């Protein structure tokens, strides 16, 4: 129940020198508490985790935990390129009393299911009294979570479910059907939020949620109320905002941090290289998207 | 409105000699009229169109039209490997007073968008007073319908919409949003029926619908009524039946024709080679699926 | 030995009405005999086989056989969408005394290996005293020829080898190593001719060979002589000609038939729709490629 | 000329505690000097670079440079998940006087060509008086090096060429043809060594070279001498050894470190997790491969 609803992915908050900002993180966590979201997914790829050091990630979760404790549920993504660094973040995260721990599969190399199962179980062993969520992200990490690797992962009692980042909503259905009522599948594709929710995803973690959290909460209220016409209107509004945010030269998360600077006065810094920075030409796209968010809120809330 | 709802794909009906059965087609069309489905999608890939001659396909539509006229809406899939053969089926289909005409993209070779646009427009020109539905089937025909090829196709006024066979429900959303209220997107993936319907597909054409039409009609009644829990229960029941039907050595359509022989006494013949025939070992799978259909009907209807 | 060397794919020869030209076929076969190539691969995809009727294909092979008998070795590609039509071409081709028969896998649907093995064996049974060539063309027909399927097909004694259309030259190496000296692997990718020939392909069948057969014969003479610098110079010359021929709006085979009209006075007609026709703007590309062929011949022969 | 020939990828040398072994690195570098290879490719993916910290990689190159100076040419792979960490390794490597610096594209996220060009140019700027090698590795890093991106990177005068890890040998041909005589393309796929070397790769960097360097040097001597039959015999021998090394449960590099322990008495440690360790059942595969290497050497040297 504590994992059901809208859990935005937590962005990377930098200072003007390109280093993790404790004030920025505490600031962005106060924003999510204020917006009334269910939880926060920390140090995921939307949090620029691929580009952070082990110490950078410890500082983010530490500062999220100063603000978020009995108000938001926190999922801490702890996977690293190494099993060793991943175990260190898993220990650390359990040390700060986190709700769940998450892990993408091993990266760059396409390892067998036994190595993937060993990687995830080794991370789960480093935080043995906390919930664990596995992934299905074939498009970035290579291959999709099979039902055989998932059966193997359900042998670990800490596994509470899957973050389904693949595009077929059938994957959600198949994992939910195979796992049953004691597991949860989180909808990954923000653009298919309503579709992944109706077919079986009781959870939803997304990288665009932070830009317009009230829209996803309203969309979720319509889904739970069963008004699919009002839900479909909000989904379409969210999707055109995403497509506008993706039309910039600069990275989507650079666009989102500039939207939050306009709409909320939050200073989250820039995006870490190699993510492309915003250019002068993107500011009109950044202003247009920020206004589309304000307009959607007035129309649907 | 005449295209909205459940439109099953019409199966290939053979005699015991492996030739098209007029009695079998008329028989299977009386079955769909009786079950109260919105329409019938004739000579699509579920109708073994890849394996039929031009004359075989004319005989099927002729016999569907003897039974179906003012009771079912009929979409006739007329694409062939050639533009020439495709135009012949398009003429013929307009000759028999068909509702719409459909066409997969060119096959085997990956042709440019201009050749695909020319192929589809040439077929549309051969039946110039009938509705035309284009495809998005990247997984079989090679590449996905782009928004640029779709913009080009909307210049033809006979184009009423798209049959979306790709897996992302985002594709439905994007095509519906780009096209607007004067176009329809038909949900292709049977396993995501409820998800593709809520996000924007007002139509639904599927190859498994014929095996359990009352389940898809009930599922659609729940979707239209907004009861997503009862819809999700029917979707899961349909999906486990599909997964059982796909677990046979013989082809799914061979399994379905044997299920319809058990549950309805319909004799639709076998599947045309190279489609794999059922083996002795598949009969227990065929009996188990037929019983799962009977059980689903009693539970949800 | 009769299959070793340069075997160009035989083009579709039409009259001005878009129907198969007996005079055109006999004409194009006299061209290949004159150029001293090892054989001719008839009714393959470069021969527009996907777009020909069963009777169209019988007329082509009949007319190739009037000219080619004891001078060229003939491989007749007999696969059709159906097993039935494929068997008819296999019978017919054996009736005319061809050297080998070839077959792409089943297309559009992704069938299991047993259905593919049954399709190919059924075609091989229709011509039981003639050599049979299987394919590996993952990029068009879906999935690559696995070693398992290849082991299964080596149980049929008529199987003489594989036409390798995939891009990895490792595939040639792996099939040659697994099969041994009693089988032949034909190099498919014209642009990697020299690379597939050195790693194990003793055969070579290509769609661009007909445009400049003397260049591939010279390239092969260098490969057999072990002069890799002169071979690499010819390969690069052939590859820039191919890239120029592919830069047209009209299909490559439309470009090639127009080059053969300029350089040889051969009238092979146009390309069958949906293959895109040449436009006025392509004639400069067609003239430039024809001159690059003339220039390559003078430089390397 | 200093980059032409056999450049093995340098393995990760650990102590029994799983930390970088200075003695192990110096030891493995003395091995390559002794075997008479052209150079050594340090901290590439075969060097477990994805799993090393910035300080781990500095220690490896430092210890390679104590042994290798005027005897081997050194290519130091400096890419990291961050641009920042990558620049640090680029500075460091230039500080130790390496011949060239190499960089895979940005990983996990699929960034635009401008971000990839910026990432590589930023790394090249951190070592501005040293040669730079770009990659084409679509299978692991997502998308292939386009000609457009390659044209952009040739604007940087430090770019000396491409390490081609894709499977089509046409890619080598196309990059060599476009770039000309002032650039070099290194053959990536060890299994296609002879095929990439004949079509235009004057360089060759591989992960299996370290297990049998004398075989690749002999294979290269045959290629340069133009004896394609003796080259093809060595290629086939190398390829069956690779396929045996890949048949283990444990990772290929774990297999190779155990082969070097048997055949050379080198102690390179194990593979860093998540790379799967060898199991008891793999020792027979490890012994069989080591013997196949000894047998190949006696047959071809």
Swiss-Prot record, chains A, B, C, D:
Enzyme category, top tier: lyase
Catalytic residues as annotated in Swiss-Prot or TrEMBL: 135 (proton donor), 163 (schiff-base intermediate with substrate)
Up-regulation conditions: Induced in the presence of 2,7-anhydro-Neu5Ac or alpha2-3-sialyllactose (3'SL).
EC number: 4.1.3.3
Entries under InterPro entries matching the protein: Aldolase_TIM, DapA-like, NanA
Pfam families (UniProt xref): DHDPS
Single GO MF annotation: N-acetylneuraminate lyase activity
Residues bound to aceneuramate: 45-46, 165, 188, 190-191, 207
Reactions this protein catalyses: aceneuramate = aldehydo-N-acetyl-D-mannosamine + pyruvate
Domain of life (superkingdom): Bacteria
Cellular compartments per GO CC: cytosol
Subcellular localization: Cytoplasm
UniProt KW keywords: Carbohydrate metabolism, Cytoplasm, Lyase, Schiff base
Mutant phenotype after disruption: Deletion of the nan cluster abolishes the ability to grow on sialylated substrates. The fitness of the nan mutant is significantly impaired, with a reduced ability to colonize the mucus layer in monocolonized mice.
Pathway given in the UniProt record: Amino-sugar metabolism; N-acetylneuraminate degradation; D-fructose 6-phosphate from N-acetylneuraminate: step 1/5
GO biological process annotation, one example: N-acetylneuraminate catabolic process
Subunit structure: Homotetramer.
Family of this protein: Belongs to the DapA family. NanA subfamily.
Function summary: Catalyzes the reversible aldol cleavage of N-acetylneuraminic acid (sialic acid; Neu5Ac) to form pyruvate and N-acetylmannosamine (ManNAc) via a Schiff base intermediate. Cannot use 2,7-anhydro-Neu5Ac. Involved in the degradation of sialic acid, which is present in the host mucus layer and represents a much-coveted source of nutrients for R.gnavus, a prevalent member of the normal gut microbiota.
Identification of the protein by name: N-acetylneuraminate lyase
Species of the source: Mediterraneibacter gnavus (strain ATCC 29149 / DSM 114966 / JCM 6515 / VPI C7-9) (Ruminococcus gnavus)
